[PDB]
């Protein structure tokens with residue numbers, strides 16, 4: 186229901202790029218186009234697609250005219266651009282090497298820290314598109330405020346991520362479950378699943394407070410799992426599938442893995458972790474990975490995935506209504522594949 | 523009329539910081555407070571003050587109640603935060619050393635490229651304040667759109683700045699007057715003088731298109747001069763007054779000085795510039811400065827300042843009405859001091 190809506194979502198990028206790219210600022214426009222083409226393309230588009238899919242499912246098909254549907258694709262593309270803005274900056278700050286199957290933008294010869302302003306431009310495009318396509322709609326300001334507030338929450342999460350993961354500075358006692366859950370709520374949960382569903386809600390005239398809170402209850406939990414998965418895949422994923430080289434151990438991250446490791450470790454295993462975590466030497470990173478395997482963390486992850494799936498399902502049963510459960514079911518099929 | 527309104531503008535920062543700083547995200551809130559205190563303080567506050575001053579001058583004193591005035595200080599503080607967000611990022615990208623009399627935030631031990639997310643947070647605070655204080659006002663959306671569009675224009679200017687000034691890559695023929703004027707229009711003119719005056723207009727219910735275009739005609743020119751001055755002061759200013767070490771020559775910038783140099787230089791002077799521009803060696807930078815002095819660029823700047831002042835004055839006579847000319851006069855007194 187996604188799979189049979191992509192290529193058309195993806196096909197529309199060319200039109201997104203064309204309107205954003207319409208004499209003195211020509212060189213700047215040409216660089217924006219480069220930035221958009223390198224950084225908003227090559228991922229799974231599940232976040233932008235979710236706006237489109239949910240919009241079809243929430244709006245009476247008789248309001249689903251040609252212009253309404255165009256606004257849906259645009260707002261979905263807005264969500265993709267929000268992602269792109271954050272990832273460009275996140276790769277700089279995480280010292281990452283590849284993303285989406287190619288070198289990180291900032292690693293490109295001749296880009297480097299210019300990418301900071303490139304990221305800002307991507308953000309700015311969100312609001313340019315919103316004005317261009319949605320300014321006359323009753324939900325215009327709901328959407329603006331949703332994107333801005335989603336960004337604020339994400340940056341507060343990015344702040345906790347980076348605080349709790351200081352370079353050169355082991356301190357494993359920081360890395361707790363309570364801490365972990367807060368980081369990922371803010372850095373991932375809001376802008377990943379709440380944002381795109383909430384956007385389609387607003388566009389559908391569903392603006393109730395209580396209805397947004399109920400959608401949250403499900404979507405924030407989905408987002409938590411998705412970040413736990415992302416952390417597991419950072420060490421245990423195949424870079425040719427994920428499209429990126431993992432950095433969590435060297436970056437001293439409060440990864441779900443290091444939290445689960447800490448819950449399990451013998452005092453002697455503690456010392457091996459502390460001696461080897463947070464450092465750039467492949468040797469030391471390999472030692473951490475072998476401790477994690479010693480501790481059967483891959484099996485612990487597979488069990489958590491099953492229990493989290495059942496949990497999200499429980500939550501859909503409690504909280505979906507009066508929204509079509511398919512809204513939440515489609516999404517959950519996509520993330521727990 | 524500024525001078526006798528500062529300390530009260532400045533005094534209000536403590537309240538700005540307090541509301542933005544009101545359990546899981548505590549560490550992140552504490553870091554936001556640090557960021558705000560380091561980066562939004564220690565400048566001249568002329569941009570934020572202009573919102574306050576212009577608001578008093580445009581709004582009938584009987585609408586100027588306690589809440590209206592509080593909104594004015596807040597929106598002025600919004601303009602200061604926009605500045606702060608841009609400068610934090612600009613210092614990274616310009617490889618700068620000091621700002622406002624202290625080391626650049628990103629140069630702080632233990633900050634570094636975390637400052638990218640700190641800058642984003644500063645941006646986000648703009649819109650948090652707008653919601654907190656202005657959400658019920660008829661000009662709420664005018665203001666949001668003004669700040670967002672001001673940011674977009676500034677980032678397009680930052681894009682031209684950085685394109686035209688590539689590291690390691692002399693090409694002096696890029697550095698033209700036409701090019702220069704476009705860079706500075708976008709990177710400085712909009713968010714420096716148009717923004718704060720326009721904000722006070724909107725808050726005063728002055729939302730006419732034509733009235734905003736007329737205010738622009740004056741304010742965009744003021745902003746151009748202000749950037750020409752900034753460039754002159756980069757090489758010829760006293761760092762204990764400006765509060766910052768200059769980087770333009772080493773950063774290979776399309777500075778007004780290098781443009782004026784190029785207009786004047788003997789073919790042999792051309793080669794000295796080309797041989798020495800855009801490089802980190804103090805020796806080579808000193809050679810550029812001595813060419814500029816050879817060419818009497820300080821005298822050329824002083825003459826341009828006088829002619830630009832007379833021009834802006836001409837423009838105030840043409841375009842101020844029906845706004846109080848004092849709006850524009852106060853500002854011009856402050857910048858051509």
Ligand SMILES: O=P(O)(O)C(O)(Cc1cnc2ccccn12)P(=O)(O)O
Nearest residue numbers: 271272275279339343372373415419
């Ligand atoms: O690098 P990835 O792709 O593994 C990563 O997942 C990227 C990520 C997660 N949440 C955010 C929020 C803002 C910017 C990037 N974000 P992580 O959090 O692990 O850096």
Ligand SMILES: O=P(O)(O)C(O)(Cc1cnc2ccccn12)P(=O)(O)O
Nearest residue numbers: 608609612616676680709710752756
């Ligand atoms: O570093 P300064 O203070 O000399 C500088 O004037 C800073 C500056 C001017 N215009 C902008 C726009 C966005 C961010 C910074 N901006 P410059 O343009 O010369 O970098």
Ligand SMILES: [Mg+2]
Nearest residue numbers: 275278279346
């Ligand atoms: Mg990260």
Ligand SMILES: [Mg+2]
Nearest residue numbers: 275276279281
């Ligand atoms: Mg990352």
Ligand SMILES: [Mg+2]
Nearest residue numbers: 415416419433
């Ligand atoms: Mg990751």
Ligand SMILES: [Mg+2]
Nearest residue numbers: 612615616683
């Ligand atoms: Mg600059």
Ligand SMILES: [Mg+2]
Nearest residue numbers: 612613616618
């Ligand atoms: Mg600079």
Ligand SMILES: [Mg+2]
Nearest residue numbers: 752753756770
């Ligand atoms: Mg400068």
